[PDB]
Amino acid sequence: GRMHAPGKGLSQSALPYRRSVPTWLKLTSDDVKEQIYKLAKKGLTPSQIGVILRDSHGVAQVRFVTGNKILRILKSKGLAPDLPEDLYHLIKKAVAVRKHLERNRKDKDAKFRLILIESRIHRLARYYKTKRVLPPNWKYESSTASALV
Amino acid sequence: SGALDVLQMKEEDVLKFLAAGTHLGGTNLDFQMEQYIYKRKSDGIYIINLKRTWEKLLLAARAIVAIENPADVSVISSRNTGQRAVLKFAAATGATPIAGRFTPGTFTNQIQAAFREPRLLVVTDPRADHQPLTEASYVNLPTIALCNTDSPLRYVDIAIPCNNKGAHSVGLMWWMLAREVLRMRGTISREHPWEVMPDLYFYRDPEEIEKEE
Amino acid sequence: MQNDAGEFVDLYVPRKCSASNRIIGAKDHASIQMNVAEVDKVTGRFNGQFKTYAICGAIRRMGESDDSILRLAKADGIVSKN
Amino acid sequence: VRMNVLADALKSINNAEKRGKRQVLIRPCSKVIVRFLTVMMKHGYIGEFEIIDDHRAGKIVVNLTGRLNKCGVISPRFDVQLKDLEKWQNNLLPSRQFGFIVLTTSAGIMDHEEARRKHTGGKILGFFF
Amino acid sequence: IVKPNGEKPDEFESGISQALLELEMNSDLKAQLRELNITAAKEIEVGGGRKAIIIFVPVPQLKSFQKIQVRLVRELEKKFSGKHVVFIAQRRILPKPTRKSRTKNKQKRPRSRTLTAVHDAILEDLVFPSEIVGKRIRVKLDGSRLIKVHLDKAQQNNVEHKVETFSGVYKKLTGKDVNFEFPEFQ
Amino acid sequence: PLAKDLLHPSPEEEKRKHKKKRLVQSPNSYFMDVKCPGCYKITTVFSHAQTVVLCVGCSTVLCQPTGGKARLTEGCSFRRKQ
RNA sequence: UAAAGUUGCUGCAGUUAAAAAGCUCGUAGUUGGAUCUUCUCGGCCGAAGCGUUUACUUUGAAAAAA
């Protein structure tokens, strides 16, 4: 079930058994790589890049075409985000919740949800520290939070 | 039937089944009766696969014939529709009928006056005939039932999938079972039609009785 | 069953359910032993042979006795392949 | 969450065997699960099984001949020396004439009789009788 | 063209090389085959007296063979009569490290030179035209393993006969019994 | 039902089940090629598109995102791939 | 001390008999999914016996008597 929610919804992507490139798909590996590069230049995160490629360009999954993941491709080209996208999204969600809270102080439910989001951020940051994806001194604080966005 | 051509379904049996609404099940389906239905109609009625019904009928006939003493087969019907059918079945084959009320303890109370110890049990409807079905759990009594789409299959060892709400279907089912039992036993005729017509087994309500008389 | 000498010492070997391969207890009164009359190939009459199926009361109590007997008969060739 | 997938496999097999099912679906599969099932099969307890190969983790459909009284896991996998094997046999097995204890030893995954035959202890995985 | 590991070709490898060279000299596929070369070959008995050829190919050029695979096998079957030909990349299997070993490899074994990955890849490229759409490993009462590989039903019409030549080749270079079947729901 | 061949199930039943609960998980989604009356280049579209994908040669959209399958627009003909 | 499976690791209990924290987060703790088949050459033809680690298992040595 969800980490901080009582729900246990079973909803996710179901990858097909076949791992090959689709018959309809005609772009070679380099074309999809340059599409990814231009989308990253637009500023889209790898989640958005994959969504746009799947919805518009007919690629089922770029990992079956170019043989590599989107974030790996961006890191190889050197235009990857400074911090991982999911941690950044959690950071900005916590920042928005704090901004809402600092006016609505009576909002105790917002305080509870902020505690939940901060716990998720702490766990994600700890994991990314064990993987050496973040500097070991990287610390999320209530003060230097909106600057990371 | 055993895929035997001599035991295969004919056109006359199909026509009789369709005439009497045998294929017309109920609007509810038992999960253990699913293997015998074929589809659901637009009006929410479960069509019964007639080949499945024929196979179950022939299996039940094989079960009945294998009993050497015909009196040891007991045919029971509490609903008014099946009483004439089971009486005619017992007359034609030799089973022991119980029409109307079934006395609890008929099989378990060895002191009672009407205490009979059958070797096979055939009932018209497991829902209406739940008492002999439950009593068959105490005396090692295998049971054949004329089950519908909704009828439960507890203690029912050979369920024949057929309409049993209507009098015509019950009568025709009992008639065909008697016909097949007499055919495998060696009497009556397999190649040419049986003497008794199916309408002898049909139950007639007093309205039909007074209209025909 | 057998001891070291090899002689069978048990009182009796009990019946096993044809549907579950489980032993049928000696006080299981719901269990049945159905005989299905074997029928000659070309005439369709009861030739004196039959197939025996022992079904435990646990299977009957849950309604699967009918499906089990149908499956056994189908595997024996009594029921045509539908 | 799900830990000790062998426990889940054995519990599913036990529940299906009690219910009289002829086939049981096990997911996810693993090397340990397949070795345990092969140990079971060599003794005639389960019969043939098929590994459905998904591209994430296998599933296993096991035919169930009715021969299994109980299949169970031991958790944690206690270290079992050869001298300690008899106490485990007494605790877990219903008789000394049948029933097996499965051990992961350096020679593979094997019943207690084979491990005693090869003079090797190991860690106890489970049992079946 | 053939450059085996020992670099010395044999008679059948030389014959395959010369057939490919003659294809280069006069055919519609000269452009592709100029930058293309194979590494080995061998003749095995898929069943009874029947025979089949295993064109071993360098891995980087294996993809280059795939796009021209159908025509290449067409010409090779035309040359060699009723003997089937299958193109397989030459993949080396790094042994699984053990407690006893030697200081000859200071780098981790890639998860593509393992026996499992290499054998899966061999099954994949054994037949380029038809793609696996599911496989199941059946374990018999004696502990043996039988793989059953499901192929595309829409591509059944051209690889029914090549079945049992896939089985022979796989039993030769992998040592595992595999059957090939065609399901309906792809 | 005490005997269910889980190895080979009915295609109808596997199409009925959840995308994950099936023997081998397969998505309920598909890719189509959409043709517009005034444009001569095919454009692949995901069935469950999350974005408003536009046609470069026409002023109309190809599909609206929804909670599930995308809402294809009339005037564009779809043909599902594979 | 056993009986005491009435201290429960084996092996107890926790709806109503005694009993689950009002609820959630969370560190230490505990637990953790699939996946990897001798080399300086050498004493009647002339030696590899860890030339990447623990747990575990098996062996050997060493280990007072009573």
Swiss-Prot record, chain B:
The keyword Electron transport does not apply. Residues 160-179 are annotated as: Laminin-binding. Changing residue 179 to G: In ICAS; reduced protein levels. It comes from the Eukaryota. Residues 53-112 are annotated as: Interaction with PPP1R16B. Monomer (37LRP) and homodimer (67LR). Component of the small ribosomal subunit. Mature ribosomes consist of a small (40S) and a large (60S) subunit. The 40S subunit contains about 33 different proteins and 1 molecule of RNA (18S). The 60S subunit contains about 49 different proteins and 3 molecules of RNA (28S, 5.8S and 5S). Interacts with RPS21. Interacts with several laminins including at least LAMB1. Interacts with MDK. The mature dimeric form interacts with PPP1R16B (via its fourth ankyrin repeat). Interacts with PPP1CA only in the presence of PPP1R16B. Belongs to the universal ribosomal protein uS2 family. This is Small ribosomal subunit protein uS2. It comes from Homo sapiens. The lineage of its organism: Eukaryota, Metazoa, Chordata, Craniata, Vertebrata.
Swiss-Prot record, chain C:
The keyword Cytoplasm applies. Pfam families: Ribosomal_S21e. GO terms for molecular function: RNA binding; structural constituent of ribosome. GO terms for cellular component: cytoplasm; cytosol; cytosolic ribosome; cytosolic small ribosomal subunit; endoplasmic reticulum; nucleoplasm; rough endoplasmic reticulum; small ribosomal subunit. The modification N6-acetyllysine is found at residue 81. It is found in: Cytoplasm, Cytosol; Cytoplasm; Rough endoplasmic reticulum. InterPro entries: Ribosomal_eS21, Ribosomal_eS21_CS, Ribosomal_eS21_sf. The keyword Hydrolase does not apply. Gene3D superfamilies: 3.30.1230.20. The modification N-acetylmethionine is found at residue 1. GO terms for biological process: cytoplasmic translation; endonucleolytic cleavage in ITS1 to separate SSU-rRNA from 5.8S rRNA and LSU-rRNA from tricistronic rRNA transcript (SSU-rRNA, 5.8S rRNA, LSU-rRNA); endonucleolytic cleavage to generate mature 3'-end of SSU-rRNA from (SSU-rRNA, 5.8S rRNA, LSU-rRNA); translation. There is a cross-link at residue 41 (Glycyl lysine isopeptide (Lys-Gly) (interchain with G-Cter in SUMO2)). Keywords: Acetylation, Cytoplasm, Endoplasmic reticulum, Isopeptide bond, Ribonucleoprotein, Ribosomal protein, Ubl conjugation. Component of the small ribosomal subunit. The ribosome is a large ribonucleoprotein complex responsible for the synthesis of proteins in the cell. Belongs to the eukaryotic ribosomal protein eS21 family. Component of the 40S small ribosomal subunit. This is Small ribosomal subunit protein eS21. It comes from Homo sapiens.
Swiss-Prot record, chain D:
PROSITE patterns: RIBOSOMAL_S8 (PS00053). It is found in: Cytoplasm; Nucleus, Nucleolus. Keywords: Cytoplasm, Diamond-Blackfan anemia, Nucleus, Ribonucleoprotein, Ribosomal protein. The keyword Nucleus applies. The modification N6-succinyllysine is found at residue 87. InterPro entries: Ribosomal_uS8 (IPR000630), Ribosomal_uS8_CS (IPR047863), Ribosomal_uS8_sf (IPR035987). GO terms for molecular function: RNA binding; structural constituent of ribosome. Its main location: cytoplasm. GO terms for biological process: cytoplasmic translation; positive regulation of cell cycle; positive regulation of cell population proliferation; response to virus; ribosomal small subunit biogenesis; translation. Disulfide bonds: none annotated. One of its GO terms (cellular component) is membrane. It holds the Pfam family Ribosomal_S8. Component of the small ribosomal subunit. Part of the small subunit (SSU) processome, first precursor of the small eukaryotic ribosomal subunit. During the assembly of the SSU processome in the nucleolus, many ribosome biogenesis factors, an RNA chaperone and ribosomal proteins associate with the nascent pre-rRNA and work in concert to generate RNA folding, modifications, rearrangements and cleavage as well as targeted degradation of pre-ribosomal RNA by the RNA exosome. Required for proper erythropoiesis. Component of the 40S ribosomal subunit. Part of the small subunit (SSU) processome, composed of more than 70 proteins and the RNA chaperone small nucleolar RNA (snoRNA) U3. Belongs to the universal ribosomal protein uS8 family.
Curated annotation (Swiss-Prot), chain E:
Its main location: cytoplasm. It comes from the Eukaryota. It is found in: Cytoplasm, Cytoskeleton, Microtubule organizing center, Centrosome; Cytoplasm; Nucleus, Nucleolus. GO terms for cellular component: centrosome; cytoplasm; cytosol; cytosolic ribosome; cytosolic small ribosomal subunit; endoplasmic reticulum; focal adhesion; membrane. One of its GO terms (biological process) is positive regulation of gene expression. Keywords: Acetylation, Cytoplasm, Cytoskeleton, Diamond-Blackfan anemia, Isopeptide bond, Nucleus, Ribonucleoprotein, Ribosomal protein, Ubl conjugation. The modification N6-acetyllysine is found at residue 67. GO terms for molecular function: mRNA 3'-UTR binding; mRNA 5'-UTR binding; protein kinase binding; RNA binding; structural constituent of ribosome; ubiquitin ligase inhibitor activity. InterPro entries: Ribosomal_eS7, Ribosomal_eS7_CS. There is a cross-link at residues 63, 67 (Glycyl lysine isopeptide (Lys-Gly) (interchain with G-Cter in SUMO2)). Belongs to the eukaryotic ribosomal protein eS7 family. Component of the small ribosomal subunit. Part of the small subunit (SSU) processome, composed of more than 70 proteins and the RNA chaperone small nucleolar RNA (snoRNA) U3. Binds IPO9 with high affinity. Interacts with NEK6. Interacts with DESI2. Interacts with IPO5, IPO7 and KPNB1; these interactions may be involved in RPS7 nuclear import for the assembly of ribosomal subunits. This is Small ribosomal subunit protein eS7. The lineage of its organism: Eukaryota, Metazoa, Chordata, Craniata, Vertebrata. The gene is RPS7.
